[PDB]
Amino acid sequence: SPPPIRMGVDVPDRIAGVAYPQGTTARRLAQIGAVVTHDGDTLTVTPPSWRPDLRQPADLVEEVLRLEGLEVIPSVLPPAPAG
């Protein structure tokens, strides 16, 4: 098994800009074969041996977002910086 990865429970929600229902991140990461443990608001995710592409929290975010679907991500224009 690859080394474990610590990631905030709401990190996929913050990156996607979507308040996913509770347990959405943990269920998806378990669906792809990873061991998910809880420690307050921080998850510890050990990806399966056939997923060495999962090395960082960003890799885990891609798993939750692609399984939940990118079509649920809303179109929100960022604020205009004073250019």
Add this chain to the structure above:
Amino acid sequence: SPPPIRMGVDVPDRIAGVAYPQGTTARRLAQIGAVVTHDGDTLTVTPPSWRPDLRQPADLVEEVLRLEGLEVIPSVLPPAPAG
């Protein structure tokens, strides 16, 4: 005496974007000759008879801001959206 005006004690601080010291609003409004009473967090201000221009809380904001000096107002760029 013109009719009394009710205004939050922090309204000049919000309009100016400046955290004025404690009691600055009530001090400046009594200086120009108004009667100031405290009802929790809301002030009740009765302008003097020689100040009929003081009819709304915005007029009271100008009195506090101009006596403290507009130079203390910082320069912050607004959050303009994508045009």
